[PDB]
mmCIF file with all atom_site columns, C-alpha atoms in Angstrom:
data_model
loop_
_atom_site.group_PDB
_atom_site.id
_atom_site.type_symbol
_atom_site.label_atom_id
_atom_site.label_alt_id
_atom_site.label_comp_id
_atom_site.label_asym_id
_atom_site.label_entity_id
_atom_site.label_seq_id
_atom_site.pdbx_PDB_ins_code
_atom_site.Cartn_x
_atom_site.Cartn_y
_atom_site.Cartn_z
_atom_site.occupancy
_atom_site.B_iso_or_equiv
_atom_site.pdbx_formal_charge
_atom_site.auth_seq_id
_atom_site.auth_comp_id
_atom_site.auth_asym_id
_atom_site.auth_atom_id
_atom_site.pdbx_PDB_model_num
ATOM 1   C CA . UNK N 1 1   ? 100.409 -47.969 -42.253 1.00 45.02 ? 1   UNK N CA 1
ATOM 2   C CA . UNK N 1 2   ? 100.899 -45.774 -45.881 1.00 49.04 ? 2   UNK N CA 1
ATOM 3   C CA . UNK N 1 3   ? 100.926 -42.341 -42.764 1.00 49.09 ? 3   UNK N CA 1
ATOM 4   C CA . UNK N 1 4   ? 102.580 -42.285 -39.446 1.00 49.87 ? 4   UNK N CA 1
ATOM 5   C CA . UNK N 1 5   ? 101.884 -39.461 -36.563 1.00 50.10 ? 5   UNK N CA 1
ATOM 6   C CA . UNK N 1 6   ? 105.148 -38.010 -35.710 1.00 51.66 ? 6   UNK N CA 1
ATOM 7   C CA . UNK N 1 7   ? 106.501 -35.287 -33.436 1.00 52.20 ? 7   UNK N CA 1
ATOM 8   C CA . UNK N 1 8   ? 109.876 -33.651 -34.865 1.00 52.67 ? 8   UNK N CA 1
ATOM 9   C CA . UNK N 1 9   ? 111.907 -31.468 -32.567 1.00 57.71 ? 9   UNK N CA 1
ATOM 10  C CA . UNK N 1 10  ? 112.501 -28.436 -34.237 1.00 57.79 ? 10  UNK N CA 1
ATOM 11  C CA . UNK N 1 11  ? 116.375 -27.337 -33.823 1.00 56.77 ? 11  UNK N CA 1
ATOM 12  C CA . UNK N 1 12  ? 118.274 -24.119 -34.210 1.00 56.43 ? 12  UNK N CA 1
ATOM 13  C CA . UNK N 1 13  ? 120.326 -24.499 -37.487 1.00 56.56 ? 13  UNK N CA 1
ATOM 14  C CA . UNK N 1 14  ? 123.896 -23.351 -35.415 1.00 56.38 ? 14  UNK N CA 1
ATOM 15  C CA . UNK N 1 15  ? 122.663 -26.208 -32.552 1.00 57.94 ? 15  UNK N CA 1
ATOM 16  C CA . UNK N 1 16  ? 122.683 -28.738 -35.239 1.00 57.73 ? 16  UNK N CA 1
ATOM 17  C CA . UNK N 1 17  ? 125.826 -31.284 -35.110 1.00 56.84 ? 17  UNK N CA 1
ATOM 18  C CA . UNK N 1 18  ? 125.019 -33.668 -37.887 1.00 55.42 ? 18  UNK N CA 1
ATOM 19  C CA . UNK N 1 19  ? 124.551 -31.599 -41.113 1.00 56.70 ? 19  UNK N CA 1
ATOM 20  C CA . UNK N 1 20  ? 122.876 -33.787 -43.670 1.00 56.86 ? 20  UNK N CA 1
ATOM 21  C CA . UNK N 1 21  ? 122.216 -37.519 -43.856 1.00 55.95 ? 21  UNK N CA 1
ATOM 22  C CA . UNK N 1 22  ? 124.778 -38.482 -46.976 1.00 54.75 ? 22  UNK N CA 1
ATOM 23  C CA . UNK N 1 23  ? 126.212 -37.823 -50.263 1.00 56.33 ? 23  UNK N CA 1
ATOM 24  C CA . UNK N 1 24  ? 123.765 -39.183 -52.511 1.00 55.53 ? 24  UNK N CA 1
ATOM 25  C CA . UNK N 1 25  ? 119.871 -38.163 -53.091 1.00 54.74 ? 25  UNK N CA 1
ATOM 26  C CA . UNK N 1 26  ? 118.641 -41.977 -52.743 1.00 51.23 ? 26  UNK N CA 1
ATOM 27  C CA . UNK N 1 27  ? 121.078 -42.217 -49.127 1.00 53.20 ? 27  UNK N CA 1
ATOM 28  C CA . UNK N 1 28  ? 119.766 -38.843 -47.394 1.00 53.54 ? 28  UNK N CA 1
ATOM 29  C CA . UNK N 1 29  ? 115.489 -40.174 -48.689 1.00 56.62 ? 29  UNK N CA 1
ATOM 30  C CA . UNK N 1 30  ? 116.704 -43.427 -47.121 1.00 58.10 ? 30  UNK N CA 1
ATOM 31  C CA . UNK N 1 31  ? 118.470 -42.338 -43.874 1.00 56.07 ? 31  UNK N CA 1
ATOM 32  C CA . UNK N 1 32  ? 115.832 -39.256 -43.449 1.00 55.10 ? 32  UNK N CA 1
ATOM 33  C CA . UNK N 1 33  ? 113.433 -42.377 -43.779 1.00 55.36 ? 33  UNK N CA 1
ATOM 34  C CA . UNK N 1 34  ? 115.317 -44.328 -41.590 1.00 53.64 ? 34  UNK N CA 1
ATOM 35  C CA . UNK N 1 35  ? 115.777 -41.749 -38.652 1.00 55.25 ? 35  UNK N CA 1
ATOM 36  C CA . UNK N 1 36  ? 111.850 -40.758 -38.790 1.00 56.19 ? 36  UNK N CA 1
ATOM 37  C CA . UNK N 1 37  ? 111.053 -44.470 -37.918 1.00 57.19 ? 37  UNK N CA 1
ATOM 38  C CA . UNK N 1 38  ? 113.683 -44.449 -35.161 1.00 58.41 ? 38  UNK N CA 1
ATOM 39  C CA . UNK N 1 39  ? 112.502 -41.151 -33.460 1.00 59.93 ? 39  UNK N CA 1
ATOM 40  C CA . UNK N 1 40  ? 116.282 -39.474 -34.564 1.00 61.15 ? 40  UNK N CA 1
ATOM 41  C CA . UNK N 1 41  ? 115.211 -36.620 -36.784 1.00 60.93 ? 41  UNK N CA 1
ATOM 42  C CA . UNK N 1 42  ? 115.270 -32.898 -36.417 1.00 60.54 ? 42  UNK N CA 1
ATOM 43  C CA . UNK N 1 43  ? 113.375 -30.432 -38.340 1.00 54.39 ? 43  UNK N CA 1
ATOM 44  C CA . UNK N 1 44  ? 115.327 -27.022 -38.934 1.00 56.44 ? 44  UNK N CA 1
ATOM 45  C CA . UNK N 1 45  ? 113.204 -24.255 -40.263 1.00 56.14 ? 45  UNK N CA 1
ATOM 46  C CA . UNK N 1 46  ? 114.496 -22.775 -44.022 1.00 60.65 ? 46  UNK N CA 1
ATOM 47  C CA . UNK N 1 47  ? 114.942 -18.964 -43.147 1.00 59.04 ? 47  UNK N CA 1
ATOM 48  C CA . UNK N 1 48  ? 117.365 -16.440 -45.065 1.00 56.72 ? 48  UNK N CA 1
ATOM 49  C CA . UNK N 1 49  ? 120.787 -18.115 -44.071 1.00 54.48 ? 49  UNK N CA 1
ATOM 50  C CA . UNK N 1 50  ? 119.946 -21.821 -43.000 1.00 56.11 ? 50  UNK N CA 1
ATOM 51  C CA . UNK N 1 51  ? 120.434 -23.547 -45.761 1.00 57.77 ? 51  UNK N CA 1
ATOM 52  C CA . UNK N 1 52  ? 124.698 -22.626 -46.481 1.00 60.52 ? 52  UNK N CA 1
ATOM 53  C CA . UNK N 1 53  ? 124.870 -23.541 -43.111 1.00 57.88 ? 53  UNK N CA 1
ATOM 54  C CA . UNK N 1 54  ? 124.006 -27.226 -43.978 1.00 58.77 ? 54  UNK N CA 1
ATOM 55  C CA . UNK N 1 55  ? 125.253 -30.082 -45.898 1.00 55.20 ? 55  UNK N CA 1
ATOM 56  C CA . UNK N 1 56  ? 123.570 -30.954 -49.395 1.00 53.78 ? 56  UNK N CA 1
ATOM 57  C CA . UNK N 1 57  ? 121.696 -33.135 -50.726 1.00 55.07 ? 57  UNK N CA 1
ATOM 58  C CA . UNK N 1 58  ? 118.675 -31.689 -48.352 1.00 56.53 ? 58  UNK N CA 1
ATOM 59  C CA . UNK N 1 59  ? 115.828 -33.424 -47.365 1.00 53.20 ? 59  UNK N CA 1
ATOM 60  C CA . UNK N 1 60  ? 112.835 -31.026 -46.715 1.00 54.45 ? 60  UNK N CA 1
ATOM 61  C CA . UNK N 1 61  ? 109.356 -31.723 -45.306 1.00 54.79 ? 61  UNK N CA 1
ATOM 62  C CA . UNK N 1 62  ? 106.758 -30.679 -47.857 1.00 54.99 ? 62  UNK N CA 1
ATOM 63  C CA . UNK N 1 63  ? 102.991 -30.285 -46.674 1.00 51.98 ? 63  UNK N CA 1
ATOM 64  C CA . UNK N 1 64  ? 101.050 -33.145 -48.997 1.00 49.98 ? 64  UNK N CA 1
ATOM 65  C CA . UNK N 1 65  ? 97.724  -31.868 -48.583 1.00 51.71 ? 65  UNK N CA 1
ATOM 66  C CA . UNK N 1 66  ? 95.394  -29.075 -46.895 1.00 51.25 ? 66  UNK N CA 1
ATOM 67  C CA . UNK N 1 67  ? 95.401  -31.979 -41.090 1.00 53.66 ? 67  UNK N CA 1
ATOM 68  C CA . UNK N 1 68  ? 94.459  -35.016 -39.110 1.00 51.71 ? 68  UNK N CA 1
ATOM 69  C CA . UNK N 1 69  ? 94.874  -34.981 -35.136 1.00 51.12 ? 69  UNK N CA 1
ATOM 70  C CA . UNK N 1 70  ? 97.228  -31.295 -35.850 1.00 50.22 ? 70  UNK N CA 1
ATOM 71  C CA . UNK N 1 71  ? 99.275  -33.206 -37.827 1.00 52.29 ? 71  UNK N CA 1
ATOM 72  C CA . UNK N 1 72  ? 100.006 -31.841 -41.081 1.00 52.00 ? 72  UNK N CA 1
ATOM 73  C CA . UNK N 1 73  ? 100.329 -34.733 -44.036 1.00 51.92 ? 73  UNK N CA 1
ATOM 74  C CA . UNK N 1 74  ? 104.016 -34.316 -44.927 1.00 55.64 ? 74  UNK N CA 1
ATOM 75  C CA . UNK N 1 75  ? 106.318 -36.082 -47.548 1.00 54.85 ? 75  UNK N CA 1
ATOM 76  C CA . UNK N 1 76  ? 109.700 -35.988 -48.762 1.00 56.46 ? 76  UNK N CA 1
ATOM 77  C CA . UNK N 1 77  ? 111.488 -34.136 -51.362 1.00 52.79 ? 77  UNK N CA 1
ATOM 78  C CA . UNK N 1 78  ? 115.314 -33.917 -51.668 1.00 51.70 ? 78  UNK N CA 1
ATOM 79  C CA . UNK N 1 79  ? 117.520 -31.240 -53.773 1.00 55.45 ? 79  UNK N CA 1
ATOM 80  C CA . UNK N 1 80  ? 121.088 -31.154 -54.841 1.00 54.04 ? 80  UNK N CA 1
ATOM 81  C CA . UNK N 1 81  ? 122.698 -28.359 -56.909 1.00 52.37 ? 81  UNK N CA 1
ATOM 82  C CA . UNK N 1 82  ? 119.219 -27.086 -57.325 1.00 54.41 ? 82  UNK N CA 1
ATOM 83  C CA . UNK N 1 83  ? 117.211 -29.745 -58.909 1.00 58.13 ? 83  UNK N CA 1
ATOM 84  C CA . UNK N 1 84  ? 114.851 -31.557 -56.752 1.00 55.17 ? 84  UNK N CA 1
ATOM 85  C CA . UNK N 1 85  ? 113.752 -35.310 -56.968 1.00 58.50 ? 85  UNK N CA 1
ATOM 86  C CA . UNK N 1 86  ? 109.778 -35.366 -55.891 1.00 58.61 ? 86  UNK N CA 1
ATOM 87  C CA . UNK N 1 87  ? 107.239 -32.596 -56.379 1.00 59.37 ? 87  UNK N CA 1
ATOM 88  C CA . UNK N 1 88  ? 104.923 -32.030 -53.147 1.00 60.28 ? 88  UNK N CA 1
ATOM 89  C CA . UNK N 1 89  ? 103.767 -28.392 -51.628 1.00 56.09 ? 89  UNK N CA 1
ATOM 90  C CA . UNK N 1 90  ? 105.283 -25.837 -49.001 1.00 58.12 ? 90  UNK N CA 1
ATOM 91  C CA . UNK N 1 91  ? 108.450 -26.608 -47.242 1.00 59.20 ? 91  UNK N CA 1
ATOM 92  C CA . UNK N 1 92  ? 107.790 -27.298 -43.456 1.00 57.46 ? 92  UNK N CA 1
ATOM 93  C CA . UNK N 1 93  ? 111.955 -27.175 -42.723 1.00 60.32 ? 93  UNK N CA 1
ATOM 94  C CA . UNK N 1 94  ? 115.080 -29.325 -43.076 1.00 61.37 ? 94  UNK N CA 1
ATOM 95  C CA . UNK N 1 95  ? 115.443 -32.551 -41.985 1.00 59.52 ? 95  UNK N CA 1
ATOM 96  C CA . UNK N 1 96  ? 119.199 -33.064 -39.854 1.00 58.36 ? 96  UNK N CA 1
ATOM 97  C CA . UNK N 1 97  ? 119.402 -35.996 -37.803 1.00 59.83 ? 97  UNK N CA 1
ATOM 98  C CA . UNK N 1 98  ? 119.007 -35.806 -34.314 1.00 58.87 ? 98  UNK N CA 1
ATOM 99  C CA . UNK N 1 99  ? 121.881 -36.524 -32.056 1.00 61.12 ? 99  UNK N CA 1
ATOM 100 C CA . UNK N 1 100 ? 120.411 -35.088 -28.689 1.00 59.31 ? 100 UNK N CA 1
ATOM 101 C CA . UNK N 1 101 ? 120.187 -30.973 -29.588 1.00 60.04 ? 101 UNK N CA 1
ATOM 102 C CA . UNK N 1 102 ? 117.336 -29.591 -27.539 1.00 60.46 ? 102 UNK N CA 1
ATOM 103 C CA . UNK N 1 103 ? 114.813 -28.168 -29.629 1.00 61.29 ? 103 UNK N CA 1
ATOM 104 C CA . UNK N 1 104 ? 113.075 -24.623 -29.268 1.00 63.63 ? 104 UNK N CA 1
ATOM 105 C CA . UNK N 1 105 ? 109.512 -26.658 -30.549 1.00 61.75 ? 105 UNK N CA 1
ATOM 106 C CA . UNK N 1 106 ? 107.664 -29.735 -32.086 1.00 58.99 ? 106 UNK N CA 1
ATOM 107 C CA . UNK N 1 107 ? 106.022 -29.932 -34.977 1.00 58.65 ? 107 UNK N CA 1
ATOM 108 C CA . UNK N 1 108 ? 103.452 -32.395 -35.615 1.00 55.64 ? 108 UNK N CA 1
ATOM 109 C CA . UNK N 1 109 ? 103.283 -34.307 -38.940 1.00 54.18 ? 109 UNK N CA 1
ATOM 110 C CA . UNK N 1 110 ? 101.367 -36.859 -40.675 1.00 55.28 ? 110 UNK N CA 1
ATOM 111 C CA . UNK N 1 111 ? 104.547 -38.710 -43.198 1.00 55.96 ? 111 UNK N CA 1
ATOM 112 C CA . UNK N 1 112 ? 103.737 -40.469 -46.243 1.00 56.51 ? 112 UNK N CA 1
ATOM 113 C CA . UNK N 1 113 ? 105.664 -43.748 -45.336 1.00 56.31 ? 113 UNK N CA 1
#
């Protein structure tokens, strides 16, 4: 399927263990990828301070269109020393992998795949 129906846990940035997928844009899009198949992503929601806190390059969630089932239509975008490599709309949060944190929420997302 081009869209899968996922549910992200939603983690407190000073929770998180794991602060970024890799070193490289192409690794974090392809481990971020990886994780959301494999039900081992976290979502941190960008708020003044978050973002220092983590490890570049960042994947964010960017809402793809204006919602199926509650699930917003999501895709991909990374960034590293301020240039970003896609173009999509408003950041939904951070993706961190998940390594057992307990979220706070869930946030439901249709991802371009």
């Amino acid at each position: 399927k081009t869209h899968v129906q996922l549910s992200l846990p939603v983690l407190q940035v000073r929770d998180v263990l794991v602060r970024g997928f890799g070193d490289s844009v192409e690794e974090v899009l392809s481990e971020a990828r990886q994780h959301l198949k494999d039900g081992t992503c976290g979502l941190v929601e960008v708020e003044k301070g978050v973002l220092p806190q983590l490890e570049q390059p960042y994947v964010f969630i960017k809402r793809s269109d204006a919602a199926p089932h509650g699930h917003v239509m999501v895709e991909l975008v990374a960034e590293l020393e301020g240039i970003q490599y896609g173009r999509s709309g408003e950041t939904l949060g951070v993706l961190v992998p998940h390594v057992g944190e307990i979220p706070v929420a869930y946030r439901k997302v249709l991802l371009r795949k």
